[PDB]
Each structure stands twice: as C-alpha cells, then as structure tokens.
Amino acid sequence: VRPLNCIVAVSQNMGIGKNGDLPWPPLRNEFKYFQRMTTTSSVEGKQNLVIMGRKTWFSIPEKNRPLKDRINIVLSRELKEPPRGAHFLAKSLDDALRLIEQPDLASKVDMVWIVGGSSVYQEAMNQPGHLRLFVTRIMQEFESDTFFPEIDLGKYKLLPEYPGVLSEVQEEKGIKYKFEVYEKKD
Ligand SMILES: NC(=O)C1=CN([C@@H]2O[C@H](COP(=O)(O)OP(=O)(O)OC[C@H]3O[C@@H](n4cnc5c(N)ncnc54)[C@H](OP(=O)(O)O)[C@@H]3O)[C@@H](O)[C@H]2O)C=CC1
C-alpha cells in the first residue's frame, strides 16, 4: 500500500494508445498477466487496489467493471459521484493516495496499482518515493496517439528478476512481448 506499482504495456515506439483504445489487437495472454499481477494480494483477507483515470475506466468493457476482486478507484475532476461499480472517486492522485493510507482501509488493502491511462502514469511518475514500473515490452511498432513517459535508467533500475514474473520472450498472434520490472526507491 506504500510502494506505487504502475503496470503498462508499451510498443517499441513507446506507444500506449490510439484513438482511446490500445494500439495493438487484443493480447489475451498479456491481459492474463495484468489480471494476475494486479489481483494477487500478498495476504489472505486483503485485496489489491487499482487507481485509473476516468477515460481508462470507461474504456473497460462494462461487463468487466469494476476490475473483479480489486478495490477500484477512479480519478476525475468533473464527476462528483463514483461511476457505477467503482468503489471510490478521487479528484486528484494525492487525494486517492491519502485515502488509501487511512486506517479504515488498512486491513482491507494490500498492493496499490496504477493501471492507466497516459495522464495518470505521468503524474504517478512525478511522485517522490517508492515506485515500480511493471512494463510489458511489445516488441513491434504500432501507430499511436499517446506515449508512455521516458524511462530514465538513471532513476529506474531494471530488475534482473522479480518474484512471480517470467523473463522469457512471449508470443501471441505473431506479436512478441516480454515482461520487465523497474524500480525507483525511497
Ligand atoms: N498501454 C496500456 O497499458 C494502457 C493504455 N491505456 C490508454 O490510455 C490512453 C488515454 O490516456 P488519457 O487520455 O490520459 O486518459 P485517462 O485514462 O488517464 O483519463 C483521463 C482523465 O482522468 C482524470 N485525471 C487524470 N489525471 C488526474 C489527476 N491528476 N487528478 C484527478 N483526475 C485526473 C481526468 O478526468 P476528468 O477529465 O473527468 O477530470 C482526465 O481527463 C488510451 O489510449 C488508453 O487506451 C489505458 C490503460 C493501460
């Protein structure tokens, strides 16, 4: 609940979005990794938490909202009530992070995951303190509207391994990809 974990999939040209959806066709195996990582808490009786922007929330198929077995927080400056299905609404990343640390939620929340979109990764990456980036490198170029912020290797250490994360190149529908974990301490 203290370290912030961002999870994203990025094309070779650092693309993450096109026209409000993903630049590539659905990678269901990639999705399963996102589901496993964001859902699997380290403690029985606690759930992980996902924070996402308003556009990303509404870009999730309604039949798949909220993201199951995670506490879902949506960021929005204009909505006044949480979207239907969402557990909480926050008007700022700071508000959301302050909320998560409340004692009311201590025996309820384990890991915190930022899950999109562009604008939220940007602001999460502006935070001081402990950040992880779970980055799926999609090993191909795709036409993109939006881009993941630069990953400064002076700031983020590329971990050689991470528990529960396989390092081999994967392939789905002719599209190769691999899982990486970066960490910025303090
Ligand atoms: N490649 C990947 O792994 C992923 C890609 N995506 C992609 O992300 C792209 C879109 O990103 P983006 O346009 O930034 O949309 P977002 O999903 O981040 O939604 C943006 C909205 O979130 C709210 N918001 C953002 N930051 C803050 C904050 N600091 N405090 C309070 N509210 C905030 C605002 O809502 P409001 O306007 O209501 O005030 C803002 O307009 C899409 O292409 C989508 O496909 C999404 C998830 C994962």
Curated annotation (Swiss-Prot):
InterPro entries: DHFR, DHFR-like_dom_sf, DHFR_CS, DHFR_dom. The keyword Membrane does not apply. Its EC number is 1.5.1.3. It catalyses: (6S)-5,6,7,8-tetrahydrofolate + NADP(+) = 7,8-dihydrofolate + NADPH + H(+). It is an enzyme of class 1 (oxidoreductase). The modification N6-acetyllysine is found at K32. Changing F31W: In L-5178-Y cell line; methotrexate-resistant; requires 2 nucleotide substitutions. Belongs to the dihydrofolate reductase family. Residues 3-184 form the DHFR domain. The keyword Amino-acid biosynthesis does not apply. This is Dihydrofolate reductase. CDD domains: DHFR (cd00209). The modification N6-succinyllysine is found at K32. Keywords: Acetylation, Cytoplasm, Methotrexate resistance, Mitochondrion, NADP, One-carbon metabolism, Oxidoreductase, RNA-binding. Pathway: Cofactor biosynthesis; tetrahydrofolate biosynthesis; 5,6,7,8-tetrahydrofolate from 7,8-dihydrofolate: step 1/1. Substrate binds at E30, F31, K32, Y33, F34, Q35, N64, R70. GO terms for cellular component: cytoplasm; cytosol; mitochondrion; nucleus. GO terms for molecular function: dihydrofolate reductase activity; folate reductase activity; mRNA binding; NADP binding; oxidoreductase activity, acting on the CH-NH group of donors, NAD or NADP as acceptor. Key enzyme in folate metabolism. Contributes to the de novo mitochondrial thymidylate biosynthesis pathway. Catalyzes an essential reaction for de novo glycine and purine synthesis, and for DNA precursor synthesis. Binds its own mRNA. It is found in: Mitochondrion; Cytoplasm. Pfam families: DHFR_1. GO terms for biological process: regulation of removal of superoxide radicals; response to methotrexate; tetrahydrobiopterin biosynthetic process; tetrahydrofolate biosynthetic process; tetrahydrofolate interconversion; tetrahydrofolate metabolic process. NADP(+) binds at residues 9, 15-21, 54-56, 76-78, 116-123. Homodimer. Transmembrane segments: none annotated.
